[PDB]
Amino acid sequence: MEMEKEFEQIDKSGSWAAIYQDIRHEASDFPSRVAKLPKNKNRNRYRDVSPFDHSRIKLHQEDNDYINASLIKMEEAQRSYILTQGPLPNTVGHFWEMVWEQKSRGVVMLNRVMEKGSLKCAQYWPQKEEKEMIFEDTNLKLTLISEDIKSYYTVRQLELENLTTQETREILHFHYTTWPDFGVPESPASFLNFLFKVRESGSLSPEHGPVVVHCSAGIGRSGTFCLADTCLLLMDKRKDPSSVDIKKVLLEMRKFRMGLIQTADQLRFSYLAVIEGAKFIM
Ligand SMILES: O=C(c1ccc2c(c1)OCO2)N1CCCCCC1
């Protein structure tokens, strides 16, 4: 079926939970043996969210190459994304090592450091120009260059220096600050405006490594971001945009990382974002 009318048909019939459970039943199951090794327990935020072995990002390190991060490679859309968890106190150095080694231009953050009164990720970037951060375990230095605070999101320019070689790079930090503590946003308008800002920066483009995107677990909000981007791109590329099937795209992405889209409300919100976004493109 088309998307917008499949949408109204699920709303009128109140069957979002049944649609979402079908997706969960059909999703791929692949091994995640490296994630579950005992030496990696303090590298995982949640015991039930793990990268698959076949698509995990490897750190260029001979001691321990593990990070909770996955490469989502979308062949028809010609986009790639790295989806990862919010860094932990003992993985902030690994996170920036991955950014460096994969040649990413942008980092997309979809959570606040504290939500619901608890810490959802480490404070992994500097908050003041004159107070830079040094990660001694991976030999990197990170400096805040500038910061632009808007009503729904903040963009920061950061300098990352590899202290071994003295090479430096400019990394853009796109921080969506207004996703609610419970549920999903009422309108997709600000989320779409945020997506378009990330796109306009060059951070999603083939001349760079894959964008790094995260929330707390790296599957819910993060899944919504890459699912919406990929579906809108396919609607531009194809002769028949109504052929884009959002459930099929989601199942394809779930071949690369488990659990993408965590609730039936997130699934509905993803539909809403693609539907509204397709009207603005034209
Ligand atoms: O700092 C970088 C840069 C960033 C990330 C990279 C990279 C280069 O190579 C590998 O990953 N640029 C490149 C162009 C955009 C702005 C100017 C400077």
Side-chain angles (χ1 to χ4, degrees):
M1 196 184 316
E2 175 191 61
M3 191 169 31
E4 173 144 37
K5 290 184 283 154
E6 190 198 351
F7 179 85
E8 320 247 56
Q9 198 241 322
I10 302 169
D11 258 5
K12 74 170 169 50
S13 54
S15 44
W16 282 109
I19 302 300
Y20 177 65
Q21 260 304 139
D22 296 348
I23 287 164
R24 293 188 58 158
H25 180 71
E26 287 296 325
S28 304
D29 190 23
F30 291 113
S32 309
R33 286 167 210 129
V34 179
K36 302 308 281 171
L37 298 172
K39 67 174 175 162
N40 291 327
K41 197 158 180 178
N42 78 341
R43 289 180 184 217
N44 293 311
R45 182 176 287 284
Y46 304 102
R47 57 152 177 71
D48 58 334
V49 180
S50 304
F52 299 138
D53 295 317
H54 79 88
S55 53
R56 72 183 184 94
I57 298 294
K58 300 179 186 184
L59 306 171
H60 300 177
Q61 222 269 79
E62 34 195 42
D63 169 52
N64 189 343
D65 72 7
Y66 177 74
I67 180 166
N68 194 317
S70 311
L71 180 65
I72 301 4
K73 189 171 184 195
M74 302 303 289
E75 187 170 26
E76 184 188 355
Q78 286 294 287
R79 280 268 223 257
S80 293
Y81 320 84
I82 294 169
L83 268 64
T84 191
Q85 71 187 9
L88 291 155
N90 60 297
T91 66
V92 174
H94 306 150
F95 177 92
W96 287 113
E97 174 186 6
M98 176 175 66
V99 171
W100 183 269
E101 288 166 358
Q102 305 298 314
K103 302 179 159 55
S104 312
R105 179 83 191 293
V107 174
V108 174
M109 172 170 184
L110 302 171
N111 63 290
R112 290 167 302 281
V113 166
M114 177 165 287
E115 298 182 5
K116 296 177 184 184
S118 304
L119 293 173
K120 298 296 169 194
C121 89
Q123 182 58 57
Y124 67 85
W125 74 95
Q127 294 179 280
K128 291 179 185 304
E129 286 89 337
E130 67 277 15
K131 294 279 203 192
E132 76 273 14
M133 292 177 78
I134 295 175
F135 305 101
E136 295 186 342
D137 58 335
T138 55
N139 216 34
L140 293 159
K141 175 177 109 172
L142 183 67
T143 306
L144 176 70
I145 299 303
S146 78
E147 179 167 62
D148 190 357
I149 300 173
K150 307 274 225 301
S151 46
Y152 291 92
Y153 69 97
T154 299
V155 189
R156 310 180 176 92
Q157 299 182 304
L158 307 172
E159 183 200 72
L160 186 61
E161 180 178 353
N162 176 346
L163 294 173
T164 301
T165 69
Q166 294 192 326
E167 310 169 283
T168 68
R169 280 176 212 161
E170 180 187 328
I171 309 296
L172 304 179
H173 194 241
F174 287 93
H175 187 180
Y176 191 80
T177 53
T178 51
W179 195 294
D181 270 14
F182 289 97
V184 304
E186 183 160 297
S187 161
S190 56
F191 194 69
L192 287 165
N193 187 59
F194 174 76
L195 169 62
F196 298 155
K197 297 295 185 186
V198 178
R199 280 185 173 196
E200 289 176 5
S201 78
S203 293
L204 291 164
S205 298
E207 63 251 24
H208 301 294
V211 70
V212 171
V213 357
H214 79 86
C215 47
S216 195
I219 61 177
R221 297 171 201 176
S222 293
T224 301
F225 183 86
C226 61
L227 181 61
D229 184 54
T230 284
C231 283
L232 290 166
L233 212 50
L234 292 168
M235 289 178 80
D236 270 346
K237 215 172 202 255
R238 285 188 186 176
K239 289 185 180 184
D240 179 14
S242 73
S243 71
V244 173
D245 185 342
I246 178 166
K247 302 187 258 49
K248 286 174 178 169
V249 178
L250 178 53
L251 286 166
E252 177 69 25
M253 292 185 163
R254 278 193 179 215
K255 297 176 180 175
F256 300 94
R257 187 167 174 85
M258 63 170 69
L260 304 179
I261 308 301
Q262 282 177 292
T263 70
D265 258 38
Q266 283 176 0
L267 185 64
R268 180 180 186 275
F269 180 78
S270 302
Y271 273 75
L272 265 185
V274 174
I275 291 168
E276 187 58 27
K279 308 166 155 159
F280 199 74
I281 206 116
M282 317 182 170

